[PDB]
Write a protein that binds this ligand. Structure first.
Ligand SMILES: Cc1ncc(COP(=O)(O)O)c(C=O)c1O
Ligand SMILES: Cc1ncc(COP(=O)(O)O)c(C=O)c1O
Lengths: 409, 409
């Protein structure tokens, strides 16, 4: 006779990714660093396995007034933090409309809030075939309806055809639906929708919004934004959210976790776009309440970091440290993609993000075999996720070789 | 037609504390520090009106390795953080049975989680007449039923009689209920239930728990624990939670916000107490699923701060600093109570907390006059809340005299 309510009763299951990383660390503890290829979890590590913490982020925290760490942030976050999020996130491609950013605990807080506020119980969140688990978990936490569509065509492009069928089905069922896209730099695939795949996406939603009884919410998860190109090309798609119908709402989920190596500081934002002023003020009012009821207010130090980072002398230093980081990951991926070509290993085309993905049918058998050799990766029904963000350049050719051996027999 | 759902739409007006607080700052701007008595918000300020950030707390953050700040915290919180929460919170008074702690974004995190997991939709949260507003807000967010009972008797002791009839009413309309008690150091009143008053409560809920069709959850908000006695006497009541029937669960909402002057770091915990091992594991599973969906994980630096504060050499310094902070606060309450007596001002007996409370029915009218004299406090239907944590000893007499005059004329 459970004490918890049904919606809050969870029949466990082991934390798989938690288990794998435990094994990886144990292996490092037994065999030593260079013997292990630790590619489980999604955190940027230097070639020596140490977690990267950008000096141009943490030098600010060291320098910061005690009071800017101690005091409460406002419910919605610092007035300047809100403004800098919008400036930073969209760069030179801010969409035309009413835009507001409210602070959240990382990107997670933003995603949760969208799903809570813009979907009712029966209503569906339509998501891609390969996805970050918490999306489903959030739906299930709040009794919203998680629903997947096949991500890729046979050629590994956006399966826009099947995307349409799944949206059509959503609108056939509910007068309110939501569509979640995790791009650019999709976890787990590494895929990014092309600027022209985004065109096809937003043109179709505008079509479906014609029926003004329908309300549609697009949730874009951009956590990996700064890791999907030179910082400009991957922001270009934002312009396509300009002047959308009133019943087509966009919520971007911003996070400092990845872009600022500030995972443990839990600082992101939900950013809403609307061609209506009352819709956005309603966005603000709804999430202000949720913030007050769930976390109260964000990590103040982190918001102030982002503010101090927008200062000219600091902005410059951060820009280079980012470019350097951005590059380290990219050439790691370029070794990977080049090796995969040599070793005839089929992989979802890499466009950005912390991971490369190998589609397979024996995903759990293959990790089993690899773990015997001290190579650690994450399996799933779809295939193997490889945390390229954790493995230095030299260990990658071995990784791809042993990966292809087990995947192709 | 709103974009947000019925539950997420908030036709809600002005933020009252916010506004009062802006007014105070604008006044300080116009007339200057000494001319103004800013007794609005619950933050420990020194005699100069500036926030208090305990060196023993923030030195640890200063000396901490970046990796401990930057990296993700485990869902539940660091293994040692969870343990050290339980030890620190209960002191020598740890109740018997199974106990688990789960990191939350401040105390707010712990409270909402309890309300989500242990009340369903029709279900009542029975809370005292004078309450911190977000309790009601959370119920409304999640569709739980907020329900009040008259806190005090005419002599200003816990209204055990009315409390009983309120709980009786819950257990008559629903198979599942919850009691919320913010003690010791109740915001707004400053009241603490005595040990025998707690006895009267647990003994009564034990009687209700005899009906094994009914499930009851006691939520205790102990944010101001360290500011409600000499450290020891105020914790004694925790022993009353030992060996409670399977169907009487207890969630204690712990916070570093006040005790560690760490509000903007957002770090608390939800600590559960049960005689059943599976009730606890069920609790662990539920709050971990909630954490994953709502905030992903806690502010890692803050958890490590608590761990590092546990080192004997790092502990001595912190206690001696907490004693002063606690003693600076109490002697402010002494000056208040001494003045209130001599100015003939009826006030709810103060036992601990950040606020002293003047009961009155003209509270909104009184604070109009008071603001004209640069005296800022928070009005409610019940009276005036004086944030004694904000104002310095030497100003209290004036604040009390002028408070008495408008309350008594
Ligand atoms: C797609 C995606 N969104 C969000 C997050 C996490 O965001 P945050 O740490 O800011 O809560 C991650 C997890 O690493 C992710 O892969
Ligand atoms: C009764 C009570 N509980 C909880 C809190 C806040 O806890 P936290 O800031 O850690 O979320 C406060 C608000 O200041 C409070 O007065």
């Amino acid at each position: 006779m459970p004490m918890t309510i049904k919606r809050a009763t969870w029949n466990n299951g082991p934390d798989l990714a938690f288990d794998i990383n435990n094994k990886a660390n144990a292996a490092i503890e037994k065999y030593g660093r260079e013997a292990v290829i630790n590619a489980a979890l999604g955190t940027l590590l230097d070639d020596k396995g140490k977690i990267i913490a950008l000096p141009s982020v943490y030098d600010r925290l060291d320098e910061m007034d005690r009071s800017h760490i101690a005091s409460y942030a406002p419910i919605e976050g610092e007035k300047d933090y809100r403004k800098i999020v919008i400036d930073t996130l969209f760069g030179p491609y801010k969409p035309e409309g009413y835009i507001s950013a409210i602070a959240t605990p990382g990107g997670t807080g933003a995603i949760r809030s969208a799903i809570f506020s813009y979907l009712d119980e029966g209503d569906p969140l339509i998501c891609h075939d390969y996805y970050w688990a918490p999306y489903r978990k959030i739906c299930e936490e709040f009794g919203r309806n998680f629903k997947t569509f096949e991500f890729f065509t046979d050629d590994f492009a956006f399966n826009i055809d099947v995307y349409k069928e799944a949206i059509d089905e959503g609108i056939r069922d509910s007068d309110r639906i939501a569509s979640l896209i995790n791009s650019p730099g999709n976890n787990p695939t590494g895929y990014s929708l092309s600027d022209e795949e985004w065109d096809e996406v937003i043109t179709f939603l505008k079509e479906k919004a014609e029926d003004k009884d329908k309300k549609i919410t697009l949730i874009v998860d951009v956590a990996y934004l700064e890791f999907a190109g030179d910082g400009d090309q991957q922001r270009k798609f934002f312009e396509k959210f300009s002047n959308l119908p009133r019943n087509l709402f966009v919520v971007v989920a911003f996070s400092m976790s990845k872009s600022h190596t500030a995972y443990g500081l839990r600082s992101g934002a939900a950013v809403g776009i609307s061609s209506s002023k009352e819709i956005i003020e309603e966005f603000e009012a709804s999430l202000a309440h949720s913030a007050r009821c769930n976390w109260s207010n964000g990590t103040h130090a982190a918001q102030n970091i982002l503010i101090e980072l927008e200062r000219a002398e600091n902005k410059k230093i951060y820009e280079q440290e980012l470019v350097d980081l951005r590059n380290m990951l990219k050439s790691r991926a370029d070794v990977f993609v080049t090796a995969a070509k040599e070793n005839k290993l089929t992989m979802i085309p890499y466009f950005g993000g912390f991971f490369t993905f190998i589609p397979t049918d024996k995903a759990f058998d293959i990790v089993k075999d690899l773990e015997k050799e001290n190579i650690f990766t994450i399996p799933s029904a779809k295939g193997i996720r490889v945390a390229i963000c954790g493995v230095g350049e030299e260990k990658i050719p071995k990784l791809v070789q042993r990966l292809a051996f087990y995947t192709n027999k």
